[PDB]
Design a protein around this ligand. Structure first.
Ligand code: BCL
Ligand code: BCL
Ligand code: BCL
Ligand code: BCL
Ligand SMILES: CC[C@H]1c2cc3[nH]c4c(c3C)C(=O)[C@H](C(=O)OC)c4c3nc(cc4[nH]c(cc(n2)[C@@H]1C)c(C(C)=O)c4C)[C@@H](C)[C@@H]3CCC(=O)OC/C=C(\C)CCC[C@H](C)CCC[C@H](C)CCCC(C)C
Ligand SMILES: CC[C@H]1c2cc3[nH]c4c(c3C)C(=O)[C@H](C(=O)OC)c4c3nc(cc4[nH]c(cc(n2)[C@@H]1C)c(C(C)=O)c4C)[C@@H](C)[C@@H]3CCC(=O)OC/C=C(\C)CCC[C@H](C)CCC[C@H](C)CCCC(C)C
Ligand SMILES: COC1=C(OC)C(=O)C(C/C=C(\C)CC/C=C(\C)CC/C=C(\C)CC/C=C(\C)CC/C=C(\C)CC/C=C(\C)CCC=C(C)C)=C(C)C1=O
Ligand SMILES: COC(C)(C)C(=O)C/C=C(\C)CC/C=C(\C)CC/C=C(\C)CCCC/C(C)=C/CC[C@H](C)CC/C=C(\C)CCC=C(C)C
Ligand SMILES: CCCCCCCC/C=C\CCCCCCCC(=O)OC[C@H](O)CO
Ligand SMILES: CCCCCCCCCCCC[N+](C)(C)[O-]
Ligand SMILES: CCCCCCCCCCCC[N+](C)(C)[O-]
Ligand SMILES: CCCCCCCCCCCC[N+](C)(C)[O-]
Ligand SMILES: CCCCCCCCCCCC[N+](C)(C)[O-]
Ligand SMILES: CCCCCCCCCCCC[N+](C)(C)[O-]
Ligand SMILES: CCCCCCCCCCCC[N+](C)(C)[O-]
Ligand SMILES: CCCCCCCCCCCC[N+](C)(C)[O-]
Ligand SMILES: CCCCCCCCCCCC[N+](C)(C)[O-]
Ligand SMILES: [Cl-]
Ligand SMILES: [Fe+3]
Lengths: 240, 300, 281
């Protein structure tokens, strides 16, 4: 039993404790596990729930303590398809409008994300003094085309992440005069158009609207992005 | 569809001079030029950079180390520029011979110069470590970066300082040379009976492989949910969004468990620092406690 | 059991094969058609490993080793005990790896996320097939593949490498190593940076991503950004594995000497090749 053996044995003991620690740290969200009816599950696993920690959020936004009582804080328009557990829950209405499945959105705070100085992180370029397109194709003015190869509108502005100097949304003007935001990660900027494969032209108007023309809240971002991503599954019939 | 590997449309605005906190603004340079090239992949802004006493000390000390190895290579090249470029990768600055032991009395051309270079490298790295600490401290951040850096310094300290001292000879240190330090690594394994059978070497490999596994998982995961703003991980920690939920659920459905937006970065930092943590232990035991890892391994 | 927020995502759809026949979960695991395939190959391959252990006469995991056929068998089939089990297990392993990736794709579709994860996993599969399929076939014998054993497969790495002197001198091997080291360097920094912002000094509010950018500009004068670092991490780990398969597919197929000799073109350029002095003069 030399020093090397003692070292490799000590390390494996240390590693087991590290894993136990890492796994509990990754249980501060979504636990305790629930049954499909919302009640707590009997089998919660061999790892206990971690003890609460507290983050102090900047800009007087309060404090978050995790773990804590969980809540969706929104209705879920789904229904069981089987007595036993493990089967899909089927939408009871329009999943895109009800925000379920790939169209899901989380009930985040109805507030905009802020930068280090307390200003809105995301802003339309028309309201961002000094910002411009420096490389690539400028999409402003281009027609926006859906997966049905119809035009839904034209790009009128870009919403930029100012601290990161990055384009995050295209503001698209619809045929009826209003506008919507399109995630930058879900569009294709081409030479003569912007193509959105996730939605059909007649589904742009259904994108959730923002309540202020110069800012977007975390809740609105989740609703907008969820709706667009949900189009990949629920707008497939009109995809040419 | 769009994959978000390269930016489609770059946008540029007034340079970001950065957060202030308790940073001494006197030691920050001006802003450098923007790089459209880097803008396709990340941020295009270069600078500003902070330059205090440690940074100046580290930088100067690091250039002396670089210059010391250099004049040696020029000396081995007979001061001929052609021979220099030809044999650049073959030049080597070796430590003192075993006969000098741990003495600093080796002449310059028989390990004396290797000791001078090692001194400059020693100051450059440790002063740079203090830099990673004070830079986080000036901004009120945690010191995770400084502690992760210690793990790399640990292996570096074992290879060229701690283990040689325990062996009683600077000749056990690594030489300064492209090809020469590769050869040193090969001979080290052969002398100690195959490092494949050093269990701390095998652990080190598992964590090296595991770092590429985990960063591919995490990088791919964040890009897959960047359509939900998933890379804004700090705000996803303070206010879980659909990005964090879809990411966690993909892996739960795939392999039976999942991480949180914060907890995945504790997996990452530990996966990485354990590479050099176990490696430094494995090297430290080679020759001091175990002469032959293969033979030692058969008895267990 | 479900996570508190999980039910709203457990909808039907997204499969590629079988429609809704395999569209369900077993505990946390999603099945799908390719989950059944994965289970089929994995169970079959594990039974063969257990059988190979019986033919070998041990149930010690540290000793079990399934060897490929002898070189004389070329690329033909071999008897089970004489390499056939390695062949069938290799087929099962490939089946499981591929089924696993297509299962991930089905999960991406149901969750409406990108396909980046299975795409990255395909690179690890490519590296495996490079060592057990592409390189053996190009060399003309399954025996050039590596054995399935905890320790014997390390001896293979050593035997193969030392056939070409010091494998360190394989120039593609250097590039792959550079990416492996840089990847771990980047993973450590990224994990440390997020934690340092989310867990600041005592008596301090949570930091912002601007603090992360400012910290790295202060440190090395450049910050790649929150998005770029995840692009970078993906690129570093994949490029490492890419140049790994590259440094092996060329070994024994278009290069047969010791890898140090590959560096002679630089040294022996007819102009400075004869200049006296230096290391090579
Ligand atoms: C990559 C280039 C070489 C090679 C070179 C080396 C070297 C050199 C070393 C290893 C080591 C290991 N290798 Mg190998 N290895 C190769 C191909 C493989 C393959 C494969 C199917 O292609 C597998 C499954 C393994 C598996 C393993 C593990 C036993 C061990 C730690 C790896 C690790 O944690 O990685 C990172 C992965 C993770 C952190 C995730 C967890 C993965 C777990 C550990 C996998 C367990 C597999 C299990 C033992 C086998 C399957 C069981 C079935 C039920 C039958 N090797 C090829 C031929 N490998 C090390 C060791 O200690 O060996 C004894 C070591 O020193
Ligand atoms: C013939 C070769 C031998 C062998 C001999 C050795 C030896 C000898 C060593 C390793 C080590 C390692 N080997 Mg081995 N190794 C072999 C086969 C393998 C195989 C394989 C596929 O078979 C693999 C995957 C590995 C993998 C590894 C790593 C896990 C490990 C290095 C960790 C690391 O991150 O280092 C990279 C990180 C560092 C070196 C840390 C340095 C940090 C310092 C602080 C940075 C200085 C900065 C400086 C100022 C530069 C400035 C530049 C700026 C840009 C300006 N080896 C065979 C059996 N191996 C090491 C180890 O730990 O072994 C257990 C080691 O010492
Ligand atoms: C771990 C065992 C060995 C070792 C074995 C190897 C092997 C094997 C390889 C390297 C490679 C490299 N090594 Mg070495 N190397 C060791 C310790 C060091 C130390 C040190 C401070 O101790 C330094 C500065 C270097 C420097 C370097 C570079 C010339 C190169 C790429 C490094 C890298 O990816 O950096 C990451 C940082 C940035 C990219 C910035 N090595 C120890 C002693 N090293 C590779 C190379 O290209 O060699 C020519 C290579 O193939
Ligand atoms: C004495 C040995 C020689 C040498 C000879 C070789 C040889 C020979 C090879 C390498 C290869 C590699 N070497 Mg070398 N090498 C040496 C020294 C080193 C040193 C060092 C510090 O000295 C380093 C850092 C490296 C580094 C490396 C990497 C570039 C590469 C291994 C990664 C890879 O391919 O992954 C690829 C990843 C995989 C193969 C994993 C795939 C996993 C699959 C897809 C899934 C597995 C699932 C699993 C079974 C399921 C388990 C389920 C359970 C539930 C857990 N070598 C010395 C000089 N090296 C290898 C290479 O390039 O391979 C392509 C290789 O074959
Ligand atoms: C977890 C272990 C891995 C790691 C981590 C690591 N390296 C680090 C850090 C961390 C956490 C820093 O904070 C520090 C840094 O500033 O990085 C940007 C650094 C650093 N790692 C560096 C290099 C480096 N790290 C390496 C390896 C590794 N670093 C490991 C794989 C390697 C090799 C050979 O693999 C190299 C060459 C420097 C770029 C930097 C330290 C700068 C320094 O000391 O400069 C002094 C010299 C001059 C100024 C000249
Ligand atoms: C390409 C970049 C890196 C990477 C990425 C990567 N790996 C991945 C993924 C990604 C992105 C996944 O999505 C997937 C995953 O789910 O990870 C959690 C995975 C994965 N990477 C894994 C392992 C792994 N990856 C490795 C490497 C890498 N993975 C690269 C470095 C390594 C090594 C050695 O470096 C290993 C060991 C698995 C944990 C997982 C894939 C699991 C899977 O495919 O499951 C289906 C298969 C089974 C359930 C069992 C199959 C049993 C066989 C039929 C019998 C055994 C055959 C085998 C050949 C025996 C030989 C063993 C001996 C060598 C000891
Ligand atoms: C920010 O976003 C992120 C998350 O959310 C917020 C994450 O959660 C993760 C996941 C990462 C972790 C949880 C870290 C730990 C994992 C590591 C170190 C990888 C190494 C993992 C392992 C060694 C475990 C591998 C286990 C398996 C592959 C499972 C074994 C396979 C089984 C049981 C078979 C599959 C089962 C079926 C098909 C069902 C049964 C079928 C029948 C027919 C009966 C990442 C990357 C992430 O960025
Ligand atoms: C025209 O070109 C000029 C001349 C200008 C140049 O500048 C060209 C220069 C070059 C091309 C330089 C090229 C550089 C290299 C090839 C360096 C290669 C280095 C490595 C592969 C890594 C080796 C590092 C490993 C070692 C041995 C590190 C030693 C670190 C120790 C922890 C420090 C040990 C300390 C000692 C012995 C004493 C010092 C004092 C104390 C109190 C500790
Ligand atoms: C101007 C000179 C160019 C730079 C000098 C060379 C030194 C960098 C080398 C290797 C580390 C790679 C850096 C990547 C690590 C970044 C960690 C991270 O998470 O950064 C994300 C973002 O910056 C937070 O907002
Ligand atoms: C005889 C003991 C030899 C060392 C055995 C290894 C166990 C300790 C490893 C972890 C070191 C502690 N740390 C710094 C990572 O928290
Ligand atoms: C069951 C025996 C385990 C002994 C070793 C335990 C290691 C704990 C790991 C510490 C994790 C990080 N921490 C708590 C230091 O911040
Ligand atoms: C290196 C391998 C990592 C080991 C991970 C082991 C922890 C898995 C936790 C399973 C229990 C989680 N669950 C089902 C209760 O949510
Ligand atoms: C040498 C291994 C170092 C461990 C790496 C992980 C660091 C965890 C410690 C967090 C630091 C806490 N604090 C208050 C200093 O910021
Ligand atoms: C933090 C993640 C932990 C991952 C643990 C991976 C364990 C790999 C086991 C490698 C085998 C080592 N050994 C001692 C047998 O040579
Ligand atoms: C050592 C690596 C192997 C362990 C990997 C994790 C095992 C599956 C995760 C647990 C989830 C399934 N469970 C326990 C809820 O039935
Ligand atoms: C499911 C896809 C299988 C194709 C790739 C399999 C590679 C292994 C080849 C083993 C050779 C076996 N056999 C019978 C052809 O000699
Ligand atoms: C050889 C392994 C086979 C499995 C690889 C899986 C690749 C998934 C990529 C799907 C491509 C979807 N797309 C076009 C949106 O990128
Ligand atoms: Cl400084
Ligand atoms: Fe991250």
């Amino acid at each position: 039993f030399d020093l090397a053996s003692l070292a490799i044995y000590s390390f494996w003991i240390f590693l087991a404790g590290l894993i136990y620690y890492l796994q509990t740290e990754n249980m501060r969200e979504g636990y305790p596990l629930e049954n499909e009816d919302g009640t707590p599950a009997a089998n919660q696993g061999p790892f206990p729930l971690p003890k609460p920690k507290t983050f102090i959020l900047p800009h007087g936004r309060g404090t978050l303590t995790v773990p804590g009582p969980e809540s969706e804080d929104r209705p879920i328009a789904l229904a069981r398809t089987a007595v036993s557990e493990g089967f899909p829950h089927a939408p009871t209405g329009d999943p895109m409008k009800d925000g379920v499945g790939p169209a899901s959105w989380v009930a985040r705070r109805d507030l905009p994300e802020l930068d280090g100085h307390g200003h809105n992180k995301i802003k339309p370029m028309k309201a961002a003094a000094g910002f411009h397109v420096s490389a690539g194709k400028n999409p402003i003015g281009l027609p926006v085309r859906g997966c049905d190869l119809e035009i839904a509108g034209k790009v009128v502005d870009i919403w930029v992440d100012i601290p990161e100097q990055m384009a995050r949304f295209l503001e698209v003007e619809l045929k009826d005069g209003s506008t919507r935001l399109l995630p930058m990660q879900m569009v294709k900027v081409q030479s003569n158009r912007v193509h959105v494969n996730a939605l059909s032209s007649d589904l742009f108007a259904g994108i959730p609207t923002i309540k202020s023309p110069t800012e977007v809240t975390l809740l609105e971002e989740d609703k907008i992005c969820g709706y667009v991503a949900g189009g990949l599954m629920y707008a497939a019939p009109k995809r040419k | 569809e769009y994959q978000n590997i390269f930016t489609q449309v770059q946008v540029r605005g007034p340079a970001d001079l950065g957060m202030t906190e308790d940073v001494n603004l006197a030691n920050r340079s001006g802003v450098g030029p923007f790089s459209t090239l880097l803008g396709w992949f990340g941020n295009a802004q270069l600078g500003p950079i902070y330059l205090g006493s440690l940074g100046v000390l580290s930088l100067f000390s690091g250039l002396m180390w670089f210059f010391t190895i250099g004049i040696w290579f020029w000396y081995q090249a007979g001061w001929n520029p052609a021979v220099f470029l030809r044999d650049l990768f073959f030049f080597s600055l070796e430590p003192p011979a075993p006969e000098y032991g741990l003495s600093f009395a080796a002449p310059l051309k028989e390990g004396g110069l290797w000791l001078i270079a090692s001194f400059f490298m020693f100051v450059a790295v440790w002063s740079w470590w203090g830099r990673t600490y004070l830079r986080a401290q000036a901004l009120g951040m945690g010191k995770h970066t400084a502690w992760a850096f210690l793990s790399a310094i640990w292996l570096w300290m074992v290879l060229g300082f701690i283990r040689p001292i325990l062996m009683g000879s600077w000749s056990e240190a690594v030489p300064y040379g492209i090809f020469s330090h590769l050869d040193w690594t090969n001979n080290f394994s052969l002398v100690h009976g195959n490092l494949h059978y050093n269990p701390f070497h095998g652990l080190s490999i598992a964590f090296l492989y595991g770092s590429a596994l985990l960063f591919a998982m995490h990088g791919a995961t964040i890009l897959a949910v960047s359509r939900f703003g998933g890379e804004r991980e700090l705000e996803q920690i303070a206010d879980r969004g659909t990005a964090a939920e879809r990411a966690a659920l993909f892996w739960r459905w795939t392999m039976g468990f999942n991480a949180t937006m914060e907890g995945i970065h504790r997996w990452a930092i530990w996966m990485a620092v354990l590479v050099t943590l176990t490696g430094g232990i494995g090297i430290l035991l080679s020759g001091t406690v175990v002469d032959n890892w293969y033979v030692w391994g058969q008895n267990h | 059991a479900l996570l508190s927020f999980e039910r709203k995502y457990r909808v039907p759809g997204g499969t590629l094969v079988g429609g809704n026949l395999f569209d369900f979960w077993v505990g946390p695991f999603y099945v799908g058609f390719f989950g059944v395939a994965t289970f089929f190959f994995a169970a079959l391959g594990i039974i063969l490993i257990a059988w190979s252990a019986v033919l070998q006469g041990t149930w010690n995991p540290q000793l079990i080793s399934v060897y490929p056929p002898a070189l004389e068998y070329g690329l033909g089939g071999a008897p089970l005990a004489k390499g056939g089990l390695w062949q069938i297990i290799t087929i099962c392993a490939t089946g499981a790896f591929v089924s696993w990736a297509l299962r991930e794709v089905e999960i991406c579709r149901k969750l409406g996320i990108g396909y980046h994860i299975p795409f990255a996993f395909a690179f690890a599969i490519l590296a495996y097939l490079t060592l057990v399929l592409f390189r053996p076939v190009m060399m003309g014998a399954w025996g050039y593949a590596f054995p399935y054993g905890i320790w014997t497969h390390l001896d293979w790495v050593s035997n193969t490498g030392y056939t070409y002197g010091n494998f360190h001198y394989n120039p593609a091997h250097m590039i792959a190593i550079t990416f492996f080291f840089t990847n771990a360097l980047a993973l450590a920094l990224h994990g440390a940076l997020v934690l340092s912002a989310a867990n600041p000094e005592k008596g301090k509010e949570m930091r912002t991503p601007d603090h992360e950018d400012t910290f790295f500009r202060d440190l090395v004068g450049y910050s790649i950004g929150t998005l770029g670092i995840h692009r970078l991490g993906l690129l570093l780990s994949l490029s490492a594995v890419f140049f790994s398969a590259l440094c092996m597919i060329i070994t024994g197929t278009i290069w047969f000497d010791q890898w140090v000799d590959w560096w002679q073109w630089w040294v022996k350029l007819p102009w400075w090749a004869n200049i006296p002095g230096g290391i090579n003069g």
